[PDB]
Design a protein that fits this description.
This is Beta-secretase 1. This protein is mainly beta and 386 residues long. The chain has helices spanning 138-145, 165-170, 219-222, 240-253, 261-264, 304-307, 337-340, and strands spanning 8-11, 15-22, 27-34, 40-43, 63-72, 77-88, 96-108, 119-122, 152-156, 174-178, 186-194, 205-210, 213-214, 227-229, 236-239, 270-272, 285-290, 297-302, 308-311, 320-324, 326-329, 333-335, 343-348, 353-359, 371-376. The chain has seven helices and 25 strands. It binds the ligand CCCO[C@H]1CN[C@@H]([C@@H](O)[C@H](Cc2cc(F)cc(F)c2)NC(=O)[C@H](CCc2ccccc2)N2CC[C@@](CC(C)C)(NC(C)=O)C2=O)C1.
Length: 386
């Protein structure tokens, strides 16, 4: 899928987006790739943060559905008017699809300054779509109206250093492969975990390790409420009971240096002199995931290079600065973009599973690497879900 490769741009903190066209004649828009929602929505009115928007009155194929729509995210909400129109992906499958578009009229803390995207593509399932599950999500529409296979795969590729808008516009941010798996985007083997339920992309975490050390909690706590694979979230988000045990474990391993409480709350950056980031004092994190085979599991391992998110310095100096990108959740585990940055991720909707392999694009050093390994005959499993 050579024509599909390098079709993404962006970064964890501002989001990863793809180019799409909407309307007739085609209107070009950058669209945030969000596997943690199911609405396809674009800015349709002027906004300070938007350099362009969808103009329905200029599209001959636009269809007004005479329905309002409201989507509340965990942080952020927009309001809009439902319609349909022809939709294309210039660096995707060679197809045109008629899709539901929410034309965005009111916005609160949804759009992001400098992000360079004007809409959001909800890749999840109908069950969590607004107004209700009767509104067909884009991917469902695409698969029904075309011969594209019922799968997509994501390579989110973080720089390991801060990128300015000039660089984020010029840089390749990754690949979204629609309908296939591209072998050039990963090393090693793909391991599959089942989709528990087709609403969010929901998974089960069986075990959690920090530098090989079991956090030793009942497996249900790891999936308290739910656990999801979500490109529309920056951080690894952990249920409070898990989060607190993890931060204590990470703090204990990284003890040789001391960090402000606000770093651990994800709010303050820490800087080191250029090139001296002490990655070695920070632990790797392993998430064990339910296998397809009964009583089998595998693990995904990420480095501090995934969970310390590069940020530009307060005075923009030569220092290498980062934010701690693991945070508290009251709505379950969100395996966000910083974890996704470690792996090539296959959303195999047809076979109801999510695949993981080590990203050919992942940031590492000469001493440690991201890993996808198995199998482990861990016991319990089976009531790990909520
Ligand atoms: C079906 C609806 C329910 O789905 C829920 C499960 N899936 C979630 C996503 O669909 C949603 C998409 C989305 C993307 C976007 F750019 C703007 C949006 F408003 C929504 N993301 C989120 O809501 C979290 C909230 C985190 C949070 C949690 C708690 C407190 C503050 C922030 N956000 C938003 C900003 C972002 C996004 C990044 C792309 C720039 N970055 C950072 C640094 O916070 C991130 O992580 C929602």
């Amino acid at each position: 899928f050579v024509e599909m490769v390098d079709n993404l741009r962006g970064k964890s903190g501002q989001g990863y987006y793809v180019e799409m066209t909407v309307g007739s004649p085609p209107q070009t828009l950058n669209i945030l790739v969000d596997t943690g929602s199911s609405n396809f929505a674009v800015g349709a009115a002027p906004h300070p943060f938007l350099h362009r928007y969808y103009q329905r009155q200029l599209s001959s194929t636009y269809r007004d559905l005479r329905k309002g729509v409201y989507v509340p995210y965990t942080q952020g909400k927009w309001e809009g008017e439902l319609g349909t129109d022809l939709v294309s992906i210039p660096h995707g499958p060679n197809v045109t699809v008629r899709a539901n578009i929410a034309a965005i009229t009111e916005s609160d803390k949804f759009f992001i300054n400098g992000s360079n995207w004007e809409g959001i593509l909800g890749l999840a399932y109908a069950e969590i779509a607004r107004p209700d599950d009767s509104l067909e999500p884009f991917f469902d529409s695409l698969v029904k109206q075309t011969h594209v296979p019922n799968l997509f795969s994501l390579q989110l590729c973080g720089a390991g250093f801060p990128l300015n808008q000039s660089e984020v516009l010029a840089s390749v941010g990754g690949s979204m492969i629609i309908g296939g798996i591209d072998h050039s985007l990963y090393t090693g083997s793909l391991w599959y975990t089942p989709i528990r339920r087709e609403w969010y992309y929901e998974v089960i975490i069986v075990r959690v390790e920090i530098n090989g050390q079991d956090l030793k909690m009942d497996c249900k706590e790891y999936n308290y409420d739910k656990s999801i694979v979500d490109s529309g979230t920056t951080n690894l988000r952990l249920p409070k009971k898990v989060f607190e045990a993890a931060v204590k474990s990470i703090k204990a391993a990284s003890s040789t240096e001391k960090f402000p409480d606000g770093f651990w709350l994800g709010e303050q950056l820490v800087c080191w002199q250029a090139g001296t980031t002490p990655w070695n004092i920070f632990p790797v994190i392993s998430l064990y995931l339910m296998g397809e085979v009964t009583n089998q599991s595998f693990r995904i391992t990420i480095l501090p290079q995934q969970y310390l998110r590069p940020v530009e310095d307060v005075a923009t100096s030569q220092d290498d600065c980062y934010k701690f990108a693991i945070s508290q959740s009251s709505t379950g585990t969100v395996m966000g973009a910083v974890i996704m940055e470690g792996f090539y991720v296959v959303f195999d909707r047809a076979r109801k599973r999510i695949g993981f392999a080590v990203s050919a694009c992942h940031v590492h050093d000469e001493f440690r690497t991201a890993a996808v390994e198995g199998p482990f005959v861990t016991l319990d499993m089976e009531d790990c879900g909520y």
